[PDB]
UniProtKB/Swiss-Prot annotation, chains A, B, C, D, E, F, G, H, I:
One of its GO terms (molecular function) is structural molecule activity. This is Polyhedrin. Changing residue 66 to F: Prevents crystallization of occlusion bodies. Major component of the virus occlusion bodies which are large proteinaceous structures termed polyhedra. These structures serve as the protective package for the virus particles outside the infected host and allow natural transmission of virus between insect hosts, assisting persistence in the environment. Forms the paracrystalline lattice of polyhedra and interacts with enveloped virions as well as other accessory molecules and structures to form a mature viral occlusion body. It comes from Autographa californica nuclear polyhedrosis virus.
């Protein structure tokens, strides 16, 4: 019409990142020109959390400690093995939209008040042994969920096949450092997981006992 | 000065995605530390909508139907042909910033109340015939504009040349599924388009009748 | 518990772009389903501004003028030389997270009221001489900080080595145009810089006078 | 006193319609000069719902269909029979304050959005066969409870006695039409009931096993 | 005009019940589509209160006691006699618009907190002796004015003439029960009155001493 | 469910007076226990205004003048004649829901500020000549629409038939008085109309040129 | 001090017009840069109202009638005579600060709604007979106090002395026209007065019976 | 009465300046003790704009340039000639209430942001040649209407007569300077006019073709 | 345009009194029809304060004491002498816009709470010795700045020349009285000054050492 006054929702997808217009997100219970991205764990696709290990680290003020120092081959071994062990059988066409290295952290003692800090690097060659302890320099501040979530992005019978099809080139080998803004040493319990975002294309078709019909 | 109280606008560009600071977007008629992205159709660059086809689909509850199943060669044929047919002559240096596959949907009957749902996949090899009908699993929710817009990104005389310069490697072949959150079958009319974002570099120069001067 | 009412902060990293949930950003002194990105200059990693040159341009209404027309080799020469000259010695493992071409603009005369406009292109081959003057077509609007900031992304002893390791393939050669929304010619002073985002991994280790211990 | 500032509640009864002053209804947790009527089902007297039948009707846009076409004798037969069958024994003096013909309507399919419309006529002589289908003309709009409630107003051993005492003259024989504001045909499930408002005068006296005392 | 924004007052009369539009009643210092009725004692016509008797009743919890048990002849005798005794001479044409049986109630002891409850019946034949005490069943709740007001509706020299012209058929013989929501016995003082609403048509004409002129 | 928080609309019809719950009327852009009536001219059924005459009256302060003094036979003659003259042919089954005597009033001079006042009487026998001028006594106050609307309620070839079927017993012969609250004489122009509320039962059937089919 | 936050009152006098700062007038229970004038009748100096005459005028729409047409000699005669008659003895030094011709107007009939309009002229020579009736052209709108107050500004034993000292040159001879914005003729009662503003300098000294001391 | 709560409008006239009480001006859709003056162009009397000339001036920062340097004789010649040329015939008695020298200013180039500044002097003798350029010293700040309006105050067949009756003594010969608060030179287009305020006394009398009657 | 919604600033000058529209003054961080005057000390023109003397006065309740009783010759002597002594050399053309007699008052003791009151008279002939003490009669109330400021309005080598050019006729000789609203005697310290408003016309021209150039 010649005049309009309500806000309409619109969505976009960029490389499996989903976005919605800001005005429509605000009005939930000019701004309209702008978009916000959906939380990946809350957005489209299934979530699949593969918890890899726990680890205790004691971190001195103004430093961060290395959480994981796997070689590339080992990172891929652990990732493929845990994912296939969890998933098989993979019964439908699906797409892994992304994989997040998630680091969950908590204090080992109560009555502590501090924030967590983090930094990561995505490596291509296992050629490089990282420092075990670094100084804090312009870190990422971890929010109150106490989780640091790193996107790693950018059907095989065995790990050998997985490597032969160089599918490991599809995602980075991460190393991650965790510290705090505390002025004392802090003991921290870390849990390291991979969260896969999976888009499943399951046909509208039943499972029958054989032989069918 | 020693003290400041107003908000200043700042912009960033990431791979032809434009961003502005949130505080400056809010104040339009700390937050300042954060950015929001501009709607691509409202942001820089020209819009060019190439409508490809319409299609009616009847979708059962808890399912979605395939909208388009073109082979790669055919997707590229249709895209190149429609774009060049529309555009020629391309008179100035320009850059295709992105191309969106847009799916517009509407009910064929009035007095229906439901939301649209969607999922897509970006393919590299036409080697794969998609299911025509799938079950709904953690879909994307389509907003009230009833449009699903998928970025496909990441000067030729003929389609043969276009293929020879492997320019098709610059953008993905999409397949898209549409359904509803309805509890009855719904007949839906779909319109599928490509919207090109074009950045034109037109010289400050007139068109003269030949010979010039 | 069976019921929850407060908002918790959560963070994600995508290719060194950091994001936080919108509800937690709003509550700083449903929305929670959405993320906003951190300003790169305010977010993690060190900032390093390498100012390259100043330039005066006089721009006619409805046009924009070319700011920089370097050949690829020259862009890389200037970038490598200025960065290494500034940085050496590079004493710790570090990662260049991104590099921004920043264009800062100001009027040369007072009492002018207009907005700045901009457009850029990221080139791969120096094979192409850009127009010096173009018409304004769906430009980017520059905010009140009067800066246009372009991400260019996606340890050497000499420039020859830098080229031999084809490290120049890691970032684009930019060309940028600047104009105004003014209805008169405007004289403008431009300052062109590179701002590097650097993530430093400095060990928790002192510097000793040799020999140590 | 010489001055008063609070509102006092006052009630009136008109032919078993109860009213209260508006100001006192507003202040529940000049206006005082006006009254509002109590909802009859929420107001004094017992409610007694006698559900008569269900019926499916398919209604075309801009029309309404006849819900019930009983002859007078049949309306009275059904009303007397259902009421006495339900009520006997009628153990105390009571007064039927009113009887409502209630039409409850619902769609037979989900995901439809429309409003219901209705019109009725109160007849005196069964001499008249109503149209089965009429056009919508200045109808009553049914509210979101999807019920149309029609007052019909203005102790017998048998229906013969009921007719002999011409008690049927106390209430009208209704015919009712139902349609929608939909632009498509709509299938609708109707439930037709009589709701009696009964005022019971039960003595303060126990029931004893005989013989008493 | 082409556009209107203020509310206009409108009135209707239904059988001497006066109504005004709700929006105009609200704005006193869409809603406009609805009417509220004027309080009869505050609305048009004169008020004439004929107080008939007082009575003390002691009421047990969950019961109500009969206030008045007059035979029809006696009700009419008392009404005609009190009205004519009060009114004569009736000097102008007038219309009795309605007559209300009003029951005013108050506790006989202070420091009691309870609400009054009531129910009535309008009878046609004195053939029926009412229970003196009944149980409370879906009663009318009396407001804080502690008055229950019952409309009875729907020029003679003597009561004999009044009966001969069967004018008693113009209004009902009421019986009324009063109780409380108290959990103890309550002693209550009742005052029973008739309030006549009278519309007087007095000519614009003086009273002269005879002979006139 | 175990808990509910929104308001639902409900409607009732009493003798062609339509009512809606107050809470649902308020929420248009406990209270729910109460109803408000729809404006009859805005509510269901067609409106049909038959304007009968205009008349100028000059009214002295504290008085009202008679607007219309028709005998019963004449009132019925004028009503039947004007209604049939307007309506014929009456092509469908219809019901006259009510008839309103409407008196519209306006000053004959500008720059006057006063309110209109009114009183009416519904007569049964033309046996009675009304005073032409009466004193103002507890009148009805006319709202700002300057209209007094009186319900008169409670298919013939000729007026003789209309009288023979004693259909005149269905509605009252009104007399109406109009005055002002002015302290000077006021000249007023009156327009007297009948507004019929008509409920039409038009079959879903076309009009064909004869012979049909 | 180095910082101030409250508002201080300040006053100025211009030719016996008193002014106060606006911010201080607002705060009574940047703006401070501005002044408002005191109402002369409410401001310093005594008020002395000399009522000269009443007059009835009947004014046609879009016109104004002359209120007073005195010759200069007569205006001065009436002013001097009335002032001295009222004032004598003038016991203290005093200053006439100003004299206002005040025209007070009221309707002669009730229930009229219109505004008053006025225009005046200050004359120097009685040489000029004014029109008795003029058309309304860009008049002054009289406020709801229904008074038009005209400043006339810019100790004698007799009028002869008053004229000999040419004291009449100190104030203008006014003529004034009054009309209304009414669309009918309006009868209006006017009262014409002079209000003197007098500043009295009474010594701090008693009155004694002679001889003093 | 003993108590009053509303505000009443009151007006005063001082030498053709009209004033209204502040409280009554505020309440338009203690303060009452104060008056505000009516805008002369919006207040009583006709407006008559005589545009004299345009002029371009280029003004350096911190200076103002002379707009007009007419000798007294020339100012009067131009004023009389333009006024009589415009007005003749002057058909009714009228009074020139005031004359304003109005200077209207605008930039000659777009996209400039500055305020205008002004100062004037009212001269009596043309004996004095003003500086063409002065420094800015405590100037008047011109508002956003970009107009400076100077009151000049305090029937002839020819200019010779106008001078002979020394009517030029009734108003001042103005000189005016205009500058800006800009920090660069600014080119400005000025338009200089005289706006006469005229109070017309037109009789209530028609124009007839001769001979009349 | 066809519609406007913002307020524009406008200014007027009346005899060196500057005014601005009220709506534009209010909106600083219909009303628009009205003007407010600028504070003279805050408005255009330079301020020049010449402090003449201090004086202590002890004032009894309900009285005011004379502050200054200079003869005319003496007032002019003191004014000319102090002004020329302060100003010489007067290097540029300037205009004295006005001169204010300012009386500043303060208590000589702390912990007193009262308001100051004042009255003045502007005299023409020194022929008149004022009372030293007067009674308070409708005084001016002094604001919290404790200053009373009186406008006196309406290039010479010596005072003799000043008198010979009768320049003293340009401004009044003031006498002023000060008191308090106190109920006890109050000792008060007065400071009496002249504040000149000066409009300076300084050429855009430097001062050179002689000889120039």
């Amino acid at each position: 019409d010649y005049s309009y006054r309500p806000t309409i929702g619109r969505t976009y997808v960029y490389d499996n990142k989903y976005y919605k217009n800001l005005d429509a997100v605000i009005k939930n219970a000019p701004l309209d020109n702008y978009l916000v991205a959906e939380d990946p764990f809350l957005g489209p696709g299934k979530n699949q959390k593969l918890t890899l290990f726990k680890e205790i680290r004691n971190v001195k003020p103004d430093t961060m400690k290395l959480v994981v120092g796997w070689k590339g081959k080992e990172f891929y071994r652990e990732t493929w093995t845990r994912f296939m062990e969890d998933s098989f059988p993979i019964v439908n066409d699906q797409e892994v939209m992304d994989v997040f290295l998630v680091v969950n952290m908590r204090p080992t003692r109560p009555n502590r008040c501090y924030k967590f800090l983090a930094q990561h690097a995505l490596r291509c060659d296992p050629d490089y042994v990282p420092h075990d302890v670094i100084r804090i320099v312009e870190p990422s501040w971890v929010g109150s969920n106490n989780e640091y979530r790193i996107s790693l992005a950018k059907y095989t019978n065995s790990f050998e096949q997985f490597i032969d099809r160089v599918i490991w080139e599809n995602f980075y080998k991460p190393i991650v450092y965790i510290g705090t803004d505390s002025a004392e040493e802090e003991e921290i319990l870390l849990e390291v997981s991979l969260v896969f975002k999976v888009k499943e294309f399951a046909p509208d078709a039943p499972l029958f006992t054989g032989p069918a019909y």
